[PDB]
Symmetry: D2
Subunit: 137 residues, 4 copies
């Protein structure tokens, strides 16, 4: 709850929420992805007049990192305005996370700084993945 | 669910796989959803030249059912040609399933008829859902 | 473009489909109905999700239903909404899905009073990316 | 010779193509987004074992810009390995672009550097947009 990298994750995630583009849901979400070498990529949800075309904070962050060449992820924290609920990643974000590993941490936070940690494997058990298309050889 | 419906659901899932439009991945998937009153709705994956625009069998089936006024689901079965492993729903499909409850059954099968069952809740722990947007 | 009879049936079907719309978040109901080459009709409605990006449009619900039942030859698709002074137009993602199955078919963008504007898929998605690209 | 900003866009778009994560299609795509103040944001397609969960280069680039506070877009260029055919944005990407304006440019290129430029409006006529969702009408 207080290791340096945890503090960094929570602060960045909380800060990233400020850039959210969510005029439809008015539900801002921020995310901060921590890579293996210590770099942090932030993200926020970006909605669309046509709801299906919006994107979640977690994926905004992951897509940013990958586009810049980072594919080794250590952890990701998520922030929202819900004070009485730990903000949890939707199934779609869990699947994208899984595309890059099942062994990394997801910090589901509350505005007060408290949080619950679960791995991608735990958040997406018996996961569909690269193996289904026989891509691991 | 009733073994009578279980079998009908499992076969419906495989038959649906025949209509799959998947020229890009060449990975056909079929699904069949059983509603509270016994009606079954099936679906298949439908790809698109631009990959993100494709849709999964599970959601094709769920969307079909909802469009007909059915939102009470008891179970959903999934089928593919993957021999080495039970076919499981991707995270996106799990989230759509969750929109309509966490206590129902998901049948992940193999081409030989064997399968494993898990509830939506077990497939999507600590899930985000409608409650997050209430109050 | 097709006969006023098929157009009317498409019209009534999309409006009727719109009644099943699951849209508690936007409270913006949308209905759609498409006509296959052999004259069959398949309809759909938008179906949203707590996580907005996982919702689906009425057009794609209709299209996906038809395909799942073996139909891939489409002649026309009609869209209906509750917008009074706006012809409801298909979003870009729906146009791309429509394109996957041809560019030479009609899209009927209607208003609640039955008035409409019809354009081909090609006209709604010019210089489109398609199966040929791959 | 092309205007300075056009050369930058074309080259950045071509470069972003290298970070493409596309093991399923093996069809790399790069994008470069030019903002009103001159900053360029790049993107690449990032696929998923479950095809529908992938993202296009154009949205990867647009999401990166927005996540950092940039919504004023001037132009975006797309690059691919398709030698004889200008790479055009899919319909989903055109809708995301439209969320932030219809009067800006889209540069559809080929590897040799030649291109066709159309506005978002021209690529997505009679578009559905934020306006259709305004409560007062
Ligand atoms: N022509 C379109 C445009 C929008 N929609 C649906 O309307 C809601 C708000 O974008 C979302 O539910 C979206 O899917 C639709 O079904 N068809
Ligand atoms: N953990 C999650 C959950 C939700 N969201 C975003 O919040 C809005 C409502 O679901 C939508 O904008 C949705 O994308 C998110 O970005 N990350
Ligand atoms: N102009 C476009 C067209 C396609 N793509 C990406 O290419 C792959 C096959 O459609 C998929 O990875 C798809 O996202 C893209 O990124 N931009
Ligand atoms: O949730 C699953 C996972 C994957 N697929 C489909 O399998 C193919 C491989 O990704 C795609 O067409 C994808 O939609 C399903 O239908 N359901
Ligand atoms: N699946
Ligand atoms: Zn998500
Ligand atoms: Zn799926
Ligand atoms: Zn649409
Ligand atoms: Zn695209």
């Amino acid at each position: 709850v207080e290791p340096e990298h945890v503090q960094r994750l929570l602060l960045s995630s909380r800060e990233a929420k400020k850039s959210a583009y969510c005029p439809y849901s008015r539900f801002p979400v921020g995310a901060a992805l921590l890579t293996g070498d210590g770099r942090i990529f932030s993200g926020c949800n970006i909605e669309n007049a046509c709801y299906p075309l919006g994107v979640c904070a977690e994926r905004t962050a992951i897509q940013k990192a990958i586009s810049e060449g980072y594919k080794d992820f250590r952890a990701i924290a998520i922030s929202s305005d819900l004070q009485e609920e730990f903000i949890s990643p939707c199934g779609a974000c869990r699947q994208v996370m899984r595309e890059f590993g099942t062994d990394w941490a997801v910090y589901m936070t509350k505005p007060d700084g408290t949080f619950v940690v679960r791995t991608v494997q735990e958040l997406l058990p018996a996961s569909f993945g690269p193996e289904d298309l026989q891509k691991i050889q």
